[PDB]
């Protein structure tokens, strides 16, 4: 959506409304897989945390302020943005970065494209005048600018793609013969390149969730034994089993997502929630969240809680059997 309609979404009210509603739908799709949609139970750090740190890696487009104006006047004149409705308020003051700030708008792509292709045509005219072949160690810095990208000119299949014509409508009429067309029906990275780069987005998302410390205080990282944080980073679906058993195959990674964010899912700031106890251990849930309960049965099987407790008890006994005469 945002790499097609790039700047046309600022002056559009129903698209921002449906963005906020739709990202709320996606968060409630995640939360109704856990049968609990409490806002305190689910921080913004459990969704926008990238997929390497264990979170979902959702991209934010709905923590903006929606421009609000007088809806008796807004259907008459071009009202100035006189008020701001809050998009998706969390109780925290997490300023979650939005993808539109990390995408170069179209006018700011096209003026730059005319500039860098004037520079390329001038360097090519000079390299023909210099009789030197224009190696691509000079165009660096302007390697990812312009539509189409300069990085197209030195890809490994330029002689093959020399004869590719009519690719736009060939990729556009895939929707009449493919069941799941790619939503990038318009662009083709073989002929245009990657027209966006969101590897700077996730860095500022991590810096906006409070760095790595404030993310991992939500997680079950501290319960794991890691000598450093840096060492943190299904062959069953291919087996012919059953149509219904693929549900449990989907169930399996949901368990590790819930167990990774389990101290902030099973946390105590709960608006309403009854403190049940786990089966046979001393873990108090704050609501019948199923996959969390299954993961805590999974860790604490064989009365491992008891086999912790007893063990520590009798180990203290050995210490007190080691230190009888001292005390």
């Amino acid at each position: 959506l945002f790499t097609y309609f790039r700047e046309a979404i600022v002056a559009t009210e129903p698209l921002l409304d449906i963005l906020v509603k739709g990202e709320t739908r996606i968060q409630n799709r995640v939360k109704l897989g856990l049968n609990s949609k409490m806002p305190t139970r689910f921080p913004p750090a459990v969704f926008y945390t990238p997929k390497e740190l264990g979170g979902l890696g959702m991209i934010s487009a709905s923590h903006i302020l929606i421009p609000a104006s007088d809806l008796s006047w807004s259907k008459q004149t071009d009202t100035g943005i006189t008020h701001f409705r809050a998009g998706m308020t969390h109780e925290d003051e997490k300023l979650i970065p939005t993808i539109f700030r990390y995408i170069t708008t179209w006018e700011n792509e096209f003026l730059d494209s005319q500039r860098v292709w004037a520079e390329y045509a001038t360097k090519r005219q000079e390299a023909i005048q210099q009789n030197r072949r224009l190696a691509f160690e000079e165009l660096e810095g302007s390697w990812d600018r312009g539509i189409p990208r300069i990085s197209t000119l030195f890809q490994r299949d330029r002689h093959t793609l020399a004869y590719d014509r009519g690719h736009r409508i060939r990729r556009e009429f895939k929707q009449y013969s493919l069941e799941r067309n790619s939503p990038f029906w318009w662009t083709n990275s073989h002929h245009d390149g990657k027209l966006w780069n969101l590897n700077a987005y996730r860095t500022d998302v991590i810096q906006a969730l409070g760095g790595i410390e404030t993310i991992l205080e939500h997680t079950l990282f501290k319960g794991t034994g890691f000598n450093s944080w840096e060492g943190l980073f299904d062959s069953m679906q291919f087996k012919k089993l059953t149509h219904a058993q693929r549900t449990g195959l989907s169930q399996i990674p949901n368990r590790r997502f819930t167990l990774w964010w389990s101290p902030t899912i099973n946390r105590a700031n709960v608006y309403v929630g009854f403190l049940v106890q786990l089966d046979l251990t001393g873990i108090f849930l704050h609501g019948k969240i199923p996959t969390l309960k299954i993961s805590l049965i999974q860790i604490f099987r064989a009365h491992l809680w008891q086999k912790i407790h007893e063990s520590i008890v009798f180990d203290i006994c050995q210490i007190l059997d080691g230190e009888l005469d001292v005390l």
Binding site: Q114, R124, H159, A162
Partner: protein, 638 residues
């Protein structure tokens, strides 16, 4: 690829002195041999007096009939200079009673009794007279250098002796090892003759690393040994340049305790002025260090050398007869070469020689002598068939070449129409043998009248009989390339040769407009004298000089009508690709490659360097391949 970038651009937006030489002191012995024997090996030491003295010896001991004596040298400079000197020695006019003969440089007349020629020129004389009747003694000198032209003359003269009792033959060598040569000429006698006595160091262990070991040896010699210049040997320009910058820099450093040290190069491309710098004195508190190729093995001297290195490597042509292909490979020298190298320390005093290998490897692991087992034979099989030799495979050769390289050579000459299928000389093969060229050059030339451009093709075959013309110094490649562009022809570097010759013949210049258009004057002169000689053979043999009004496609068709075999398609998913063998090559980084009618090249030279390259290329229409050698462009044989 060019088209796609244009599409993306559109889409986006004094007498007593000569007595003193050693050979005088065995002149009696040297009759008694010459007199008693139809063939004789003589072996010296370079400086002993053989090139000069022994031919003079022969001209008092063997005198008047209508006859001459030939001496034969592998080296144009040795022929010229030693004929000048021997004319003075006799007290006779150069070009008269003593004379030369060199390719497109003859200095002899109807008075010449003593005729000091290149091996290649005596071989061409023997194409026109297979008895060499006009000579009563023939002296093949520097036979140790085992050139193609000397080995073919040795073979020939073996046979010619058993047709002419009144021909005597004197094989003269600088390598004491005559046994091989005696045996090959039917146990013929030997007579074995100022070098000072070189010390010879060896490493205790095989080096794996000979450049840096050679650098450290030269700096060691410069610290520790008394006055005397150093001669390194190294294998090519790139290596030699690198070791000249790093021994220049390391010697500046040790100048904080050690004498001044002047490096030089030397290698085959050097401009004349930098060649002349090798001969400079040896500063003043000080020494000098020539860094040469094998050119300094035999082909010159440099007067003050007392110390030789010797990482025992050179850059030698090699030809595989069951891939069909020549290459240019860094390779261990022969024992004969290692000896010559050593004997460059020794000219001016005792000397030392610092061999970056084991004494075992000298004695037991270097081959004795190095050319017939390292050659494409096409020229050689043309010359043998002109010499009437109908059973090539049986030809009495002291080292027979692989019968596959001989067979491949007949098949080339048949596709060049020099021979018929039955291995018999066509009228082309006769006329081609009249020219001192390779068969592909000769064929091109011959047919050029019938492409209406025999002046143009005369000039391009003259150019292609010399070096590269275009100076490009490693500091000023932009200026040199700017120069070169003002003769270049877009996808036709053969036509670039025509343009720079014509500009050299322009009513506007000589020497200093060679240097200011970064041209080798020595090349362009040599190409002008070979154009003059080859036009004289053209007149002599009735081949009409012809031009048109301005016709590059005619130039193209003529060149294809020799070099048909040497064609290379553009790949259409990959690099460039070759008609013979099916090699996978690139166009040589000397020449851009206008990929729009480029789709076939004709190439002059295949160049093996770490990659396969093809060098001096000109566009061809592939339809003009199929019309101008239908028998070589048969799908059928493909």
């Amino acid at each position: 690829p060019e088209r796609w970038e244009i599409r993306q651009l559109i889409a986006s937006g004094i007498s007593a002195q000569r007595q003193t030489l050693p050979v005088y002191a065995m002149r009696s012995e040297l009759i008694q041999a010459v007199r008693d024997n139809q063939f004789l090996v003589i072996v010296g030491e370079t400086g002993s007096g053989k090139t000069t003295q022994i031919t003079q010896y022969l001209d008092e001991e063997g005198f008047s009939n209508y006859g001459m004596i030939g001496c034969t040298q592998p080296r144009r400079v040795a022929a010229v200079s030693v004929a000048k000197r021997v004319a003075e020695e006799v007290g006779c006019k150069v070009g008269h009673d003593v004379g030369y003969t060199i390719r497109f440089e003859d200095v002899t007349g109807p008075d010449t009794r003593i005729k000091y020629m290149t091996d290649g020129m005596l071989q061409r004389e023997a194409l026109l007279d297979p008895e060499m009747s006009k000579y009563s003694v023939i002296m093949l000198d520097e036979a140790h250098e085992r050139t193609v032209a000397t080995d073919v003359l040795f073979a020939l003269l073996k046979k010619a002796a058993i047709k002419r009792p009144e021909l005597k033959v004197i094989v003269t060598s600088a390598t004491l090892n005559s046994a091989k040569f005696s045996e090959y000429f039917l146990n013929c006698p030997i007579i074995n003759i100022k070098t000072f006595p070189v010390e010879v160091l060896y490493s205790q262990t095989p080096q794996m690393d000979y450049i840096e070991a050679a650098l450290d040896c030269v700096i060691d010699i410069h610290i520790n040994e008394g006055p005397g210049d150093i001669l390194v040997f190294l294998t090519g320009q790139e290596e030699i340049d690198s070791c000249c910058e790093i021994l220049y820099d390391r010697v500046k450093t040790l100048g904080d305790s050690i004498g001044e040290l002047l490096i030089l190069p030397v290698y085959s491309a050097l401009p004349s002025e930098i060649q002349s710098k090798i001969f400079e004195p040896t500063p003043k508190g000080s020494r000098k260090v020539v860094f040469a190729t094998n050119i300094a093995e035999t082909s010159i001297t440099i007067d003050g050398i007392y110390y030789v290195v010797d990482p025992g490597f050179a850059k030698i042509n090699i030809y595989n007869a069951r891939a069909g292909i020549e290459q240019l490979i860094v390779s261990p020298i022969s024992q004969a070469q290692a000896n010559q190298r050593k004997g460059r320390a020794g000219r001016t005093g005792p000397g030392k020689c610092y061999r970056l290998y084991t004494e075992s490897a000298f004695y037991n692991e270097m081959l004795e002598n190095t050319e017939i087992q390292r050659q494409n034979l096409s020229h050689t099989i043309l010359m043998l068939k002109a010499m009437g030799i109908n059973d090539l495979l049986k030809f009495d050769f002291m080292d027979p070449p692989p019968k596959n390289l001989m067979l491949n050579a007949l098949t080339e000459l048949y596709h060049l129409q020099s021979l018929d299928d039955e291995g018999k000389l066509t009228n082309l093969g006769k006329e081609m043998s009249l020219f001192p060229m390779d068969p592909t050059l000769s064929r091109s030339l011959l047919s050029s009248v019938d492409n209406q451009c025999s002046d143009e093709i005369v000039t391009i075959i003259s150019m292609l009989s010399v070096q590269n013309v275009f100076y490009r110094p490693k500091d000023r490649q932009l200026e040199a390339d700017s120069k070169k562009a003002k003769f270049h022809h877009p996808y036709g570097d053969h036509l670039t040769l025509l343009n720079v010759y014509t500009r050299w013949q322009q009513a506007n210049y000589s020497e200093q407009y060679c240097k200011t258009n970064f041209l080798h004057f020595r090349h362009l002169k040599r190409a002008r004298d070979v154009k003059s000689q080859i036009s004289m053979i053209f007149k002599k043999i009735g081949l009409k000089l012809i031009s048109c009004h301005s016709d590059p496609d005619l130039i193209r068709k003529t060149f294809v009508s020799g070099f048909f075999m040497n064609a290379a398609k553009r790949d259409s998913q990959v690099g460039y690709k070759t008609i013979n063998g099916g090699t996978e090559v690139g166009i040589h980084p000397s020449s851009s490659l206008y990929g729009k009618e480029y789709e076939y090249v004709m190439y002059h030279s295949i160049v093996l360097t770490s990659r396969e390259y093809m060098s001096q290329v000109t566009s061809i229409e592939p339809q003009w391949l199929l019309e101008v050698a239908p028998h070589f462009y048969k799908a059928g044989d493909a």
